[PDB]
Amino acid sequence: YEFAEKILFTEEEIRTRIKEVAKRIADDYKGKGLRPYVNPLVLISVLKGSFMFTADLCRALCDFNVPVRMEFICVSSYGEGLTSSGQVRMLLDTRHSIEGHHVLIVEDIVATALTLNYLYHMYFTRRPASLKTVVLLDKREGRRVPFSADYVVANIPNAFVIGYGLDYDDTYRELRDIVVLRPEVYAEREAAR
Amino acid sequence: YEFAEKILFTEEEIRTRIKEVAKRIADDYKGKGLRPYVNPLVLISVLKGSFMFTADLCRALCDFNVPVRMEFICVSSYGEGLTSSGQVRMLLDTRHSIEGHHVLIVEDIVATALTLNYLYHMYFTRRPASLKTVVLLDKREGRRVPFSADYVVANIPNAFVIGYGLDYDDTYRELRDIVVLRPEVYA
Ligand SMILES: O=P(O)(O)OC[C@H]1O[C@H](OP(=O)(O)OP(=O)(O)O)[C@H](O)[C@@H]1O
Ligand SMILES: O=P(O)(O)OC[C@H]1O[C@H](OP(=O)(O)OP(=O)(O)O)[C@H](O)[C@@H]1O
Ligand SMILES: Oc1ncnc2cn[nH]c12
Ligand SMILES: Oc1ncnc2cn[nH]c12
Ligand SMILES: [Mg+2]
Ligand SMILES: [Mg+2]
Ligand SMILES: [Mg+2]
Ligand SMILES: [Mg+2]
Known part of the structure; x- marks a missing residue:
């Protein structure tokens, strides 16, 4: 992906982690x-x-x-x-x-x-x-209000991620991997408004 | 799958057909x-x-x-x-x-x-x-109104199928495969 700064988790990795969380x-x-x-x-x-x-x-x-x-x-x-x-x-x-x-x-x-x-x-x-929550990704250093999910598949740094359902302007949801979106891509896009 | 009377497609067969449709x-x-x-x-x-x-x-x-x-x-x-x-x-x-x-x-x-x-x-x-439709399964013989989907992954017989998102009483949508529900169970 030329619009990606880096890939955080591959499809295989996500799949592996999801199975482990499911077993739990x-x-x-x-x-x-x-x-x-x-x-x-x-x-x-x-x-x-x-x-x-x-x-x-x-x-x-x-x-x-x-x-x-x-x-x-x-x-x-x-x-x-x-x-x-x-x-x-x-x-x-x-x-x-x-x-x-x-x-x-x-x-x-x-x-x-x-x-x-x-x-x-x-x-x-x-x-x-009973009420519980399972999150795919936890951007821990991004909290405005406190919250701790009962199950977390992965923790990520403070970067805007896309792929695997996550979007930026309803784009990129379809990626098989979770990647960090380049700011030059979103900056240009944001500029377009 | 005690509640199923037959397996229609396994997760791997579905996966493959979807890819063929996507390529098209x-x-x-x-x-x-x-x-x-x-x-x-x-x-x-x-x-x-x-x-x-x-x-x-x-x-x-x-x-x-x-x-x-x-x-x-x-x-x-x-x-x-x-x-x-x-x-x-x-x-x-x-x-x-x-x-x-x-x-x-x-x-x-x-x-x-x-x-x-x-x-x-x-x-x-x-x-x-433009406007087109893609349907995973098609019971061609079940039409109540004439309609043709643009893309279809598989034509199936007139039996109640479950799994792969399809449910019966909001049950079985989570199955990785598509199976036919025992008619007895559907009632
Ligand atoms: O913890 P928060 O800062 O509230 O951020 C997380 C929420 O934001 C996103 O949804 P969004 O509002 O983008 O809608 P979407 O799911 O349709 O993309 C993401 O899907 C979460 O629902
Ligand atoms: O072509 P027909 O025989 O009329 O039936 C097709 C519709 O019925 C089912 O939806 P349902 O009403 O079951 O909603 P659901 O998707 O939420 O299960 C199926 O998922 C289609 O929407
Ligand atoms: O990094 C991120 N990517 C996509 N959606 C959201 C919401 N919050 N944080 C996000
Ligand atoms: O066989 C079938 N399985 C699940 N939902 C429907 C709707 N129509 N036919 C169905
Ligand atoms: Mg959301
Ligand atoms: Mg969003
Ligand atoms: Mg439906
Ligand atoms: Mg239904």
């Missing part, structure tokens, strides 16, 4: 007696970014016999830009109630944590049986 | 001058079933250097027997306007085609540079 989620939830139809683990996939991670994660979870039920929601905060708007917009909420069910919010990245903080708070008041 | 889409768009930001191929992923197909397809398209823009839409039924035009309530629509853009609607399965036909014409009215 499976072990941690064993006592919950998850069962299809009556007791699935509800995966709240945060669109658009989480589509890819969710697709691969639910499969890895299936490998470990963890039955799941997908709920796709859509939340917006960065829009076409590089930084948090400071506002988290709910564009689509869950189709069904989460009350009394085990819920795992599936996110591609946590940076300032405004998104996950807003989401966790919203669902928390809905009284699910 | 790429060739068919080679003369569209597609470029990121300004002229990407807009994939309108119809939730919830196509989320998995969309994830692997966009990656296959990326293998062929096609710049894509992902859109996810959520539709709902107005009520029972309130239409036959396949009209659906739009709970979540495209973020960007498709007007003047090359669009590809992504679906997991087409059978009756009532909803997909409705969606096709709806987006068609928004005036995109």
Whole structure:
């Protein structure tokens, strides 16, 4: 990728880490007696970014016999830009109630944590049986508000990453690898506005 | 797979076919001058079933250097027997306007085609540079309204399939393979 400063994780690496995280989620939830139809683990996939991670994660979870039920929601905060708007917009909420069910919010990245903080708070008041979060990437040095996900596949430095569902101006979501976007590429693009 | 009466496609067979379809889409768009930001191929992923197909397809398209823009839409039924035009309530629509853009609607399965036909014409009215559809599975014999998808990964018999995004009672979407649900189970 000529627009990439560097590749952080290859597709193979992500796949490996996701399987390991799935095995852990499976072990941690064993006592919950998850069962299809009556007791699935509800995966709240945060669109658009989480589509890819969710697709691969639910499969890895299936490998470990963890039955799941997908709920796709859509939340917006960065829009076409590089930084948090400071506002988290709910564009689509869950189709069904989460009350009394085990819920795992599936996110591609946590940076300032405004998104996950807003989401966790919203669902928390809905009284699910349990509420946890799994993030693909944790940009630890990017927090504006505190938040610690229950499961983290990878930690990354303070650089704008793209690929594997993550975008910059709704571009690059389709990359198989996670890469650092060159500032000369986003600067030119940002300049175009 | 005790709940399945037969295996239709394994994850590896699906993976392969998707790549062949992506290579074709790429060739068919080679003369569209597609470029990121300004002229990407807009994939309108119809939730919830196509989320998995969309994830692997966009990656296959990326293998062929096609710049894509992902859109996810959520539709709902107005009520029972309130239409036959396949009209659906739009709970979540495209973020960007498709007007003047090359669009590809992504679906997991087409059978009756009532909803997909409705969606096709709806987006068609928004005036995109072009509009095509790609469906992973097609029950050609199930049509309730005439409809032909532009790209299809596999034609299948009239049996209820699950897995690879497809569900039954919101169950089994996470399967890596596409299997036929034991008719008894479906009831
Ligand atoms: O921790 P935060 O600073 O809140 O940043 C993380 C959020 O920002 C991104 O979403 P975005 O708002 O870009 O929407 P998107 O998923 O559709 O790309 C990313 O997908 C997370 O949802
Ligand atoms: O062509 P037809 O026989 O009418 O059916 C096709 C539609 O039904 C299914 O969606 P569903 O209503 O099941 O929504 P879902 O994708 O969220 O499961 C499938 O995923 C297509 O959207
Ligand atoms: O590095 C990054 N890439 C894509 N989206 C986001 C959001 N926060 N931080 C990001
Ligand atoms: O076989 C099938 N499996 C899952 N959803 C649908 C819709 N129509 N036909 C289906
Ligand atoms: Mg997001
Ligand atoms: Mg974004
Ligand atoms: Mg569907
Ligand atoms: Mg369904």
